[PDB]
Design a protein around this ligand. Structure first.
Ligand SMILES: O=c1ccn([C@@H]2O[C@H](COP(=O)(O)OP(=O)(O)O)[C@@H](O)[C@H]2O)c(=O)[nH]1
Ligand SMILES: [Mn+2]
Length: 351
């Protein structure tokens, strides 16, 4: 049975934590990449890592919820920085025909709530806020995001007592070559001028020319639609998030970032404040209008045409935008199923 085989593979690999390209300790920055099944975009991220300055000793953790030869071969080609692969142990690939996959007794995602209650399908009493029922493939990303946040801070042996920041990104992102240069200055700038800052972001989703802006950073209230790429957390920031575990895991939104938005408004004692450059050091390649080759060339052109402005010698805080009161987001749904709630709440308790 291939499914059972994969379960055994994932258990041993998550235990062994084989570190590639290391004979060193992780310091200052570690990257964690959420990976599913888009190797064409992963290849683009890896190319951006290859071209990035100063990261020979930056650990990059790839977190997978899908096993494939192509994906593992891509990551195995990385010879230029420390690499670790970890594997989400409750993926749909490992549990296809039972929760958190699709139990054949589950309610159809679009069966009306009133009909589901009369039918007795097993999750009929737990629709989302729109009266819909769970779809396994739409719940997986939030599960994977919350599991790997716990796993890297608590269960990765090389990160015992780690005192740097961990920067979270995704398989379809592209890093600017000065991203690490800029991160280090951003962190020093946070220590010097923004003690109220909770998190760092490498950039938002927005100029053709970088003149006068590539050296500027803003202090803003964190907002999920703007600041969900390349999010760097301290241990303190992570510990404050897990104080809101039940809220994260029960809030009826299958988006991890919209769920964080709700947390910053409803469960954290203060809104998150983020330090973020005016010129992004991270780009979303999985968005167009996508040919991955087209995306890479356009980003290459934008960054190289602006080469004279990259690697700024000094960063300065230019703007401060402080939200005092804000409406909570509307729920996007997809997260009403108590089994999703309970599995999400279990990650830090199991083993
Ligand atoms: O089953 C899945 C599907 C997606 N993702 C991850 O969710 C992130 C966002 O997915 P995508 O970029 O497709 O969504 P979009 O950016 O279009 O909202 C990516 O890092 C994927 O690797 C995942 O972890 N498990
Ligand atoms: Mn994307």
């Amino acid at each position: 049975n291939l499914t059972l085989r994969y379960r055994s593979l994932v258990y041993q690999l998550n235990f062994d934590q084989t570190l590639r390209n290391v004979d060193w300790a992780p310091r200052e920055l570690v990257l964690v990449v959420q990976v599913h099944n888009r190797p064409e975009y992963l290849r683009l991220l890896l190319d951006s890592l290859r071209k990035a300055q100063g990261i020979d000793n930056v650990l990059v953790i790839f977190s997978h919820d899908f096993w494939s030869t192509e994906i593992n071969q891509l990551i195995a080609g990385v010879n230029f920085c420390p690499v670790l692969q970890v594997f989400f142990p409750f993926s749909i690939q490992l549990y296809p025909n039972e929760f958190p996959g699709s139990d054949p007794r589950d309610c159809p995602r679009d069966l009306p709530k009133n009909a589901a209650l009369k039918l007795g399908c097993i999750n009929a009493e737990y629709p989302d806020s729109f009266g819909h029922y769970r779809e396994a493939k739409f719940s997986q990303t939030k599960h994977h995001w919350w599991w790997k946040l716990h796993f890297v801070w608590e269960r990765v042996k090389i990160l015992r007592d780690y005192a740097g920041l961990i920067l979270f990104l995704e398989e379809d992102h592209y890093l600017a070559p000065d991203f690490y240069h800029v991160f280090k200055k951003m962190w020093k700038l946070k220590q010097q001028e923004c003690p109220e800052c909770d998190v760092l972001s490498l950039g938002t989703y927005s100029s053709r020319s970088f003149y006068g802006m590539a050296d500027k950073v803003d202090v803003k209230t964190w907002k999920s639609t703007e600041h969900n790429m390349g999010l760097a957390l301290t241990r303190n920031a992570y510990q404050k998030l897990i104080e809101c575990t039940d809220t994260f895991c029960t809030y009826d939104d299958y988006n991890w970032d919209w769920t964080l938005q709700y947390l910053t408004v409803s469960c954290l004692p203060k809104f998150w404040k983020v330090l973020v450059p005016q010129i992004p050091r991270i780009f979303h390649a999985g968005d167009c209008g996508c040919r991955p080759s087209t995306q890479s060339a356009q980003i290459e052109s934008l960054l190289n045409n602006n080469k004279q402005y990259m690697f700024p010698e000094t960063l300065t805080i230019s703007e401060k935008f402080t939200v005092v009161a804000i409406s909570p987001p509307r729920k996007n749904g997809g997260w009403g199923d108590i089994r999703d709630h309970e599995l999400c709440k279990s990650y830090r308790r199991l083993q």
